[PDB]
């Protein structure tokens, strides 16, 4: 299948209260594997998945120094943006970056990302062509011209098609076993009182991974489009996820409803009902 290596970068200024807080967080296939956090006496790149402990001391030293170089560059950028936007020196501000590559099963680049946001809104992004930029406002136009001048888009393409793909290949080698992990949902239905002659049937899916999942309720084997309640999928805290979907149905008609659970961990989708004990 396809794979991705993505880095999520955060730079948060805090005037009066210190140097900005800088963070780099790396993801292989949407799971955190490394992290640099500048909020320390001696900040170091650290493995966040035990399979990264394979990498030797030179890896950590090299990534650490490059992180610290990045941090200092973003410290400058925060000041630059105060200028572009004519903002006061006193407020806290944020710069965020999503940088990375998605590769197909053949190991060729499928998509590359270089996206920036200032105070939580789009600032600039490299387009799908890996040649041109989309600037979100008048300030980003300045950066856009700057980067057009320096051939930044070309530099990014070289990274995306080279370095990024190559490292992803290496990390996969070191962590593929645990990266392919699935945990099937364990499902059950609960029964809850409603006013008058209605009841709530709640269909739980627990302990699954990855997070992607679908729950549906059917009446007599026919899907219910309106009136299904649910929660956003949520972490259990042990590396797995939870979700539920519920419907309100007539008292005495519970047995006419079935819950269906779709997840990549399962040999086939789950079908279940309220089981009166």
């Amino acid at each position: 299948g396809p794979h991705s290596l993505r880095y999520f970068v955060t730079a948060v200024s805090r005037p009066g209260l210190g140097e900005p807080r800088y963070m780099e967080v790396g993801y292989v296939d949407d799971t955190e594997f490394v992290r640099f956090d500048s909020d320390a006496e001696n900040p170091r790149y650290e493995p966040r998945a035990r399979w990264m402990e394979q990498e030797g001391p030179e890896y950590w030293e090299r990534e650490t120094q490059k992180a610290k170089g990045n941090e200092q560059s973003f410290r400058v950028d925060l000041r630059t943006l105060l200028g572009y936007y004519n903002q006061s020196k006193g407020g806290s501000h944020t710069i965020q970056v999503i940088s990375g590559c998605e590769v197909g099963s053949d190991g060729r680049l499928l998509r590359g990302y270089q996206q920036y946001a200032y105070d939580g809104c789009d600032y600039i992004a490299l387009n799908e062509d890996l040649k041109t930029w989309t600037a979100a406002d008048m300030a980003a136009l300045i950066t856009k011209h700057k980067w057009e001048q320096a051939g930044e888009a070309e530099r990014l393409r070289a990274y995306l098609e080279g370095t990024c793909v190559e490292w992803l290949r290496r990390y996969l080698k070191n962590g593929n076993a645990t990266l392919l992990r699935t945990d099937s949902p364990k499902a059950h239905v609960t029964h809850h009182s409603r006013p008058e002659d209605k009841v709530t049937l709640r269909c739980w899916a627990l302990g699954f991974y990855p997070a992607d999942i679908t729950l549906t309720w059917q009446l007599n084997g026919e899907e219910l489009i309106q009136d299904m309640e649910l929660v956003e999928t949520r972490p259990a805290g042990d590396g797995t996820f939870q979700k539920w979907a519920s419907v309100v149905v007539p008292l005495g008609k519970e047995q006419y409803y079935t819950c269906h659970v779709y997840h990549q961990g399962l040999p086939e989708p789950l079908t279940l009902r309220w089981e009166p004990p």
Binding site: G26, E63, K66, G69, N70, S73, S99, I124, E152, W167
Partner: peptide, 8 residues
């Protein structure tokens, strides 16, 4: 390995 960033 993350890219080295360039100034805005």
């Amino acid at each position: 390995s993350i890219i080295g960033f360039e100034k805005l």
